[PDB]
Amino acid sequence: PIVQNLQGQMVHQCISPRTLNAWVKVVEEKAFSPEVIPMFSALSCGATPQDLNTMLNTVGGHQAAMQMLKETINEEAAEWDRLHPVHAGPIAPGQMREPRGSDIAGTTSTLQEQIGWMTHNPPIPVGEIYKRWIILGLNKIVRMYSPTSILDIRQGPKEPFRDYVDRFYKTLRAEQASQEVKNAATETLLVQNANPDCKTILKALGPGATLEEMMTACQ
Amino acid sequence: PIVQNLQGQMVHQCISPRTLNAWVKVVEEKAFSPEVIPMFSALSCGATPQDLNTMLNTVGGHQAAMQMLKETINEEAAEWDRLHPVHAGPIAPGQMREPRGSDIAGTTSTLQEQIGWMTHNPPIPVGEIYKRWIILGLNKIVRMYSPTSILDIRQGPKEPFRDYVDRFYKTLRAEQASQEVKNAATETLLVQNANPDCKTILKALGPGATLEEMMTACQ
Amino acid sequence: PIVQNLQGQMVHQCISPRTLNAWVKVVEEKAFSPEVIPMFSALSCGATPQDLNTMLNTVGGHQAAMQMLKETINEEAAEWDRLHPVHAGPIAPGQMREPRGSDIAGTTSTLQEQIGWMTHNPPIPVGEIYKRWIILGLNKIVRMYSPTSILDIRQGPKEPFRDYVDRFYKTLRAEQASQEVKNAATETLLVQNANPDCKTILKALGPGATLEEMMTACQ
Amino acid sequence: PIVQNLQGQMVHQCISPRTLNAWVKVVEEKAFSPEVIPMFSALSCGATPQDLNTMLNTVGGHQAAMQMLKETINEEAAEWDRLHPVHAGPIAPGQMREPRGSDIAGTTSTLQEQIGWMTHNPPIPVGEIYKRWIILGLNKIVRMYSPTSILDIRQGPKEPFRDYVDRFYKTLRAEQASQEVKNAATETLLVQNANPDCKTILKALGPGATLEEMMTACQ
Amino acid sequence: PIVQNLQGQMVHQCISPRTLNAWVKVVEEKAFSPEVIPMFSALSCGATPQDLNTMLNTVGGHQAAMQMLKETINEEAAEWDRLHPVHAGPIAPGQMREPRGSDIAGTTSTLQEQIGWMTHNPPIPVGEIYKRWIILGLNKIVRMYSPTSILDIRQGPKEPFRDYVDRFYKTLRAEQASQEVKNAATETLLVQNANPDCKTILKALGPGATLEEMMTACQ
Amino acid sequence: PIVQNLQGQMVHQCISPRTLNAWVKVVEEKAFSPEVIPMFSALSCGATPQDLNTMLNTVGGHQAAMQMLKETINEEAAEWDRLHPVHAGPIAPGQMREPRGSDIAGTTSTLQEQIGWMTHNPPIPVGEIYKRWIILGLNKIVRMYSPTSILDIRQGPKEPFRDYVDRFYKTLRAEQASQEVKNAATETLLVQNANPDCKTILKALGPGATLEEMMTACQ
Ligand SMILES: O=C1C[C@H](c2ccccc2)c2ccc(O)cc2N1
Ligand SMILES: O=C1C[C@H](c2ccccc2)c2ccc(O)cc2N1
Ligand SMILES: O=C1C[C@H](c2ccccc2)c2ccc(O)cc2N1
Ligand SMILES: O=C1C[C@H](c2ccccc2)c2ccc(O)cc2N1
Ligand SMILES: O=C1C[C@H](c2ccccc2)c2ccc(O)cc2N1
Ligand SMILES: O=C1C[C@H](c2ccccc2)c2ccc(O)cc2N1
């Protein structure tokens, strides 16, 4: 990554064994459960595009996902190039060239060029731009591997309400409902999919009940 | 987080793999037992709002709790906005804008803006303000998942007094009795809920007995 | 804690995940065996009162002990207040207020105030003062949970002398004999509680035998 | 490795126990699965040639591979010497000599000489040059140990499409297909090797289907 | 311990969780096998007397040994006091007092006083002086717990020579033979205690055989 | 070890718990398999002679080897003394004395003297000189414990060629064949010791076949 030293200048630092191991292990253990994404984001704090490729490349399984990811990155790169075409021909000697899509994705740029962009005044944030494309791709993957429609999360006759809600919001998260839909469903689908005894209790609370109030009600 | 370097200026540092892992593991292992809260607080020492979202977002289970938490945070944010309304319209060029509720919660502010607020002279402590809202929400969750009323913690006929007290104060902690009530119960409910042999011993000690004195008495 | 940087000024540092985990694990694994105390002391090297509460609060079991501890801390605080009463009324603007008992224990003081006291010239060592109260309380707990009187540590007919001595001094340590009594018992209770064959060997060595000499004798 | 300190000068640092252990463990656990290569590259960030030999030499098994690697390194070294012959005879006193192939590979150069080259202005990047030769050799090894031709990866009658794709792209990666061939096969061999039910679904989508579209189609 | 910072002044640093844990674990796992001693020495690199007490005090078992250790430390302290008596009466204001035995052992000196002595120009090396006393005591313990006389290490009829030698020198190390005796026994007791077939082979090599030569001979 | 700080002066640093543990564990797990040597070398990067003794002394088993090692070190020391005799009599006040063999091996020199030599301008590299003697000794040990002659590594009738080569070069490495012999055997003993089916395939390839070519041939 690029970090501030103890004296406040922005410099490159090797990606650490702990970072490298953390990411590989979270993928091994969690696959593409939605919480992997914010872990990815945090593990790649200050990453260069080189570092982001490193992390992605160190993944051994899930090659279908990695290939889908590549496709997403290629799509974003191509859009970047549509918006920000670069001058063909020789670079001004000693000067910084403009990044293309593939430069941002780290496949046609050097670490040195990446460092130059990221520490320019002002910075051309190639790491942050690439991380956004990657996360966009990872979110498609999370949705793809979400095994269950919210429509099939229904409370079991002896299933504690709490356990049901946990299933319900876990599914909505993977299915990638917006936060509006998540805040909203408390008044609707959550109640509909509840079991008969809880549904009656909830129906009776009236509208505007918090999730806390619903969960207390059916405890 | 934001930290002082070795030279005393306040700078941003990436959240560490060790921090990230610690929090995820404490939630996996302890759920919402009350001691998770002070662990959360300590793991988020110097956190930006970004870091606080990171920690919360890396949690994979307990989505009912996470949704309740969101609701609590939205309530606090809305109160913040009631107290501290912000000027609509364009920002003074190069100047610091005032934070809204959602800015404090990190959903509408950048890391850069968060850093600007937290390192201003004097600091606008958005991380500390958000951490308070979060802890408020986590405390509601701890109380919600507390499985047992203090009324049902009664000493078993062969249960060592010590083991009973441990159950009793563990329950009071989750049920979230004030410290007055915790200091107070030594003279009352603790004695009432004791078994017959210990109750008689304790009844006889008289009032004003320390907890130490009670435990020695029924050892 | 408060630490010297690489440039020799005293600054606050976040308590580390490793510290936090170490303490929680030592309590889980050792409970209140006497060696937990010096581990506590070393893990809290340079702690603020905030850090000391953190460590104590992260403990999930042993709530009877934690409540006894609170009682001890309240007793010390009340004595502090007897010795060092503080001026009622408004603080001199921009100046440092004097700490009360509860300020030392971290329940009514901020981290900022704690830092101010601890880094004042000369320091008002609120962390060290509070750690003493805590250790005083933890020592009462160690004595309370010591399961065995020294009177009941007697050498078994086939128990190697060494194993007996280990039991004997382990018990004395938990029972909290002074170092005089520990140095002294080599001439008395240690011999009395030895088995018949070793007792005769030891009786015959005469007075002034080192522990080394006793153990060699009954090897 | 060679690193920038906190003050921006390039200095040698001992290879860490964590780095050393990470590499040994990744080889023990993954052998020459393709993801070992980018892990090697990242673990050797800033390595001198000495460090690169260290890592390779600490490997205990896989000696056939290590000997093949040596052969590849000797081939590259010999080509380096063809391109960059060095002056025979005595070195200019106090001056830097030019590196030969074996100097780059660390077998005939000292750590001091390596440091001199790598921190020269401009740097003679002997570590980076050697790492390229090594990776070239490791890629030959990955291809050699790839146990399965892409032609034999065919979807099973009850094998979920996703699991099939994962096998398919895992194999292509080890077999070392170019990225063109990887992007291309989505329209061809991937479809041909699919089972009858999925093949029909895919045949019907038409050309230009993304991998995402194929996987959704056969979900 | 006391360490040099990044700027070359000698300062106190908290003993680390890793150090604390390392020592406790080596004692748990190895007891007083002789290799514990050099581990102790290395783990206490730069220790103050406070740190040395910490390490010793964190040990939970082996209290017979810890009490023997105390006795040894008291003996050394008393000898220190014989050699270096200190002036009774009030200290010169603001000046450094001379250490007594108990000051060196950390029981009557503060951390501040210890730091003052150890960082004086020239240093009064109280940590190093105390570590010597401790090691002296630990060596007595290693000898005490050495379970086997060298006289009873004899090569078994089917025991490989190598395995026998390993037993032999392991025993000599615990029994604490000087290095002369260790270098010497190769010509004597090692041969005598060998089995009949190896003894004849060795007898025939003649005098002056290296240990390497003996081991090759009986391989 | 001796390290450069963040400001470029050469200073002593305590050997770390991680280093100490790494070495002990590699010996426990790998004994004297040849890859232990380069691990030793890397773990002792920047070691003083004190540090090198520490590492060797922390080893608990393998005392036959440790005694052989001592003998090798004594031989080298005695040769050092033959080449570099030192002036008898009193040292020039405040000046640096010349190291003897035993000074280099750390048995008659202090840490201070070692630091003085290693940080002199120019350095008298006592750590590097001693590490060479140690490695010389460790290589004798690796050869001694190599359980199998290369002559007895023959490919089994159903043993995959790859597995055979791995055995073959593992054995050659422990037996300590030169790199000439390792590069050479591909044309000879490797083929001779191959099974009948592979031998014929290899015989037919002709001379000058790479190891890669041989392994592809018999795959
Ligand atoms: O090595 C790479 C880096 C990056 C990558 C790697 C592993 C998984 C996902 C994407 C990538 C992105 C787009 C592309 O066309 C090719 C590549 N190849
Ligand atoms: O991503 C977030 C951050 C934060 C959060 C995350 C995980 C659990 C709990 C709260 C949050 C808070 C309020 C809100 O309306 C939305 C969010 N969404
Ligand atoms: O949170 C705290 C901190 C401290 C504490 C915590 C956990 C166990 C023991 C003592 C404490 C001390 C005295 C008191 O009256 C109240 C408290 N409450
Ligand atoms: O020790 C070495 C370093 C390097 C190496 C080591 C372990 C595996 C692979 C290559 C190497 C490269 C070429 C060569 O002819 C000899 C060597 N010997
Ligand atoms: O706490 C201590 C420190 C030291 C110590 C501790 C644990 C084991 C061994 C010795 C010690 C040394 C001599 C003495 O008389 C008393 C003590 N008490
Ligand atoms: O303590 C030591 C250090 C060194 C050492 C230790 C452990 C194994 C091997 C050699 C050593 C070297 C030569 C010698 O005559 C004596 C010693 N004794």
Instruction: Find chains touching chain B: ≥3 CB pairs under 8 Å.
Output: A, C
Using CB distances shorter than 6 Å, the residues near ligand 3 are B 179; C 53, 56-57, 66, 69-70, 73-74, 105, 107
Nearest residue (by CA) to ligand 4, atom 3, is D53
Cβ B70 under 6 angstroms from ligand 2? yes
Question: Distance (Å, rounded) from C-alpha A183 to C-alpha A185?
Answer: 6
Give me ligand 3 centre to Cα F122, in Å: 59
A206 Cβ contact partners less than 8 Å away, ≥ 6 residues apart:
none
Contact (Cβ atoms closer than 8 angstroms) between residue B147 and residue B172: no
Give me ligand 2 centre to Cα B70, in Å: 5
Residue among E95, E131, E101 at smallest CA distance from E113: E95
Fold of A1-149: Human Immunodeficiency Virus Type 1 Capsid Protein (1.10.375)
Interface test with A, best of D3, D211, D216, D218 (most A CBs within 10 A): D211
- Of all helices (H) and strands (E), which one includes residue A12? strand A10-12
Contact D39 A58 (CB under 8 A): yes
How was this entry determined? X-ray
Residues of E in contact with C172 (CB under 8 A): 63
Tell me the torsion sign for CA atoms E188, E189, E191, E196. Answer: positive
Q: What is the DSSP letter of E10?
A: E
Question: Distance (Å, rounded) from C-alpha C30 to C-alpha C28?
Answer: 6
Contact A60 D211 (CB under 8 A): no
Query: Which residue of F51, F102, F107 sits with most ligand 6 atoms within 8 Å of its CB, as the best mutation to test the pocket?
Result: F107
Query: b/e per residue, F182-214, with b = 16+ CB within 10 A?
Result: beebbeebbbebbbeebeebbeeeeeebebbbb
The ligand that comes nearest to the alpha carbon of residue C69 is: 3
Contact B38 C18 (CB under 8 A): no
The answer to whether C54 contacts chain B (CB < 8 Å) is yes
- Of all helices (H) and strands (E), which one includes residue C50? helix C49-57
The answer to whether E168 contacts chain F (CB < 8 Å) is yes
Residue among F81, F85, F84 at smallest CA distance from F101: F81
- Counting every residue written for chain A, the total comes to 219
Question: Distance (Å, rounded) from C-alpha C23 to C-alpha C51?
Answer: 12
Q: What is the DSSP letter of A62?
A: -
Query: Which residue of D37, D135, D176, D179 sits with most ligand 1 atoms within 8 Å of its CB, as the best mutation to test the pocket?
Result: D179
Contact D42 A21 (CB under 8 A): no
Question: Distance (Å, rounded) from C-alpha E98 to C-alpha B97?
Answer: 61
Contact C216 E144 (CB under 8 A): yes
Question: Distance (Å, rounded) from C-alpha F129 to C-alpha F125?
Answer: 6
Question: Distance (Å, rounded) from C-alpha A215 to C-alpha A194?
Answer: 11
Provide the H-helix boundaries in chain F: 17-30, 36-43, 49-57, 63-83, 101-104, 111-118, 126-145, 161-175, 179-185, 189-192, 196-205, 211-217
Other beta carbons less than 10 A from residue D7's beta carbon = 15
Q: Which residue has 């690199």 as its token pair?
A: E45
Give me ligand 2 centre to Cα B3, in Å: 24
Other beta carbons less than 10 A from residue C36's beta carbon = 21
Give the phi and the psi of residue D151 in degrees, each rounded to 5: -60, -25
Residue among B155, B167, B136, B163 at smallest CA distance from B200: B155
C9 Cβ contact partners less than 8 Å away, ≥ 6 residues apart:
B8
Question: Distance (Å, rounded) from C-alpha D130 to C-alpha D47?
Answer: 10
Cβ D62 under 6 angstroms from ligand 4? no
Q: Locate B42 and state its tokens.
A: 């300590």
Q: Locate F186 and state its tokens.
A: 């591909």
Rg over alpha carbons for chain B, rounded to the nearest Å, is 23
Distances (CA, A) of A7 to A11, A132, B84, C14, D138: 11, 29, 36, 20, 39
The answer to whether F193 contacts chain D (CB < 8 Å) is no
Q: Where are the domains of chain C?
A: 1-149, 150-219
**Partner residue opposite B71 with nearest CB, options A46, A165, A211:** A211
Q: Locate C83 and state its tokens.
A: 């010795």
Question: Distance (Å, rounded) from C-alpha A66 to C-alpha A59?
Answer: 9
Give the phi and the psi of residue B130 in degrees, each rounded to 5: -70, -40
Calculate how close chain A gets to D7, using CA atoms only, in Å.
7
Decide: helix, strand or coil at residue C16: coil
Q: Locate C94 and state its tokens.
A: 């921009």
Q: What is the DSSP letter of A107?
A: S
Contact B210 C144 (CB under 8 A): no
Contact (Cβ atoms closer than 8 angstroms) between residue E151 and residue E190: no
Question: Distance (Å, rounded) from C-alpha E202 to C-alpha F108?
Answer: 33
Backbone interruptions in chain A following residues (C to N > 2.5 Å) = none
Contact (Cβ atoms closer than 8 angstroms) between residue B164 and residue B155: yes
Q: Which residues pair with E3 in a beta bridge?
A: E11
Pick the CATH number of E150-219 from 3.40.50.150, 1.10.1200.30, 3.40.50.450, 1.20.1440.230: 1.10.1200.30
Give me ligand 6 centre to Cα D57, in Å: 26
End-to-end CA distance of chain E: 48
**Partner residue opposite F71 with nearest CB, options E3, E170, E211:** E211
Contact A35 B59 (CB under 8 A): yes
Residue among E35, E172, E2 at smallest CA distance from F23: E35
Contact A63 D35 (CB under 8 A): no
Question: Distance (Å, rounded) from C-alpha E41 to C-alpha E139?
Answer: 12
Determine the longest span between alpha carbons in chain D, in angstroms: 76
- Of all helices (H) and strands (E), which one includes residue D182? helix D179-185
Residues of D in contact with F22 (CB under 8 A): 17, 20-21
Give me ligand 1 centre to Cα A54, in Å: 10
**Partner residue opposite F42 with nearest CB, options D20, D144, D145:** D20
Question: Distance (Å, rounded) from C-alpha C69 to C-alpha A210?
Answer: 38
Other beta carbons less than 10 A from residue F28's beta carbon = 12
Q: Which residues pair with A11 in a beta bridge?
A: A3
Torsion of CA D165, D171, D174, D179, to 10 degrees: -50
Tell which atom from ligand 4 comes closest to the C-alpha of D137.
9
Contact B215 C64 (CB under 8 A): yes
The ligand that comes nearest to the alpha carbon of residue D50 is: 4
Which string of DSSP letters, residue by residue, matches B139-191?
A: HHHHHHH----GGG----TTS-HHHHHHHHHHHHHHHT--HHHHHHHTTTHHH
Cβ A134 under 6 angstroms from ligand 1? no
Residues of A in contact with B65 (CB under 8 A): 166
Rg over alpha carbons for chain C, rounded to the nearest Å, is 23
Q: Locate F84 and state its tokens.
A: 């570099």
- How big, in percent rounded to 5, are the helix, strand and coil portions of chain A? 60, 5, 40
Using CB distances shorter than 6 Å, the residues near ligand 6 are E 179; F 53, 56-57, 66, 69-70, 73-74, 105, 107
Calculate how close chain A gets to D88, using CA atoms only, in Å.
34
Interface test with F, best of E2, E211, E213, E216 (most F CBs within 10 A): E211
Contact A38 B17 (CB under 8 A): no
Instruction: Tell me the count of A-D CB pairs closer than 8 A.
Output: 89
Residue among C208, C166, C200 at smallest CA distance from C217: C200
Rg over alpha carbons for chain E, rounded to the nearest Å, is 23
Determine the longest span between alpha carbons in chain E, in angstroms: 76
Other beta carbons less than 10 A from residue A63's beta carbon = 23
The answer to whether C28 contacts chain B (CB < 8 Å) is no
The answer to whether F184 contacts chain D (CB < 8 Å) is no
Contact A45 B15 (CB under 8 A): yes
Question: Distance (Å, rounded) from C-alpha F27 to C-alpha D19?
Answer: 18
Q: Which residues pair with D205 in a beta bridge?
A: none
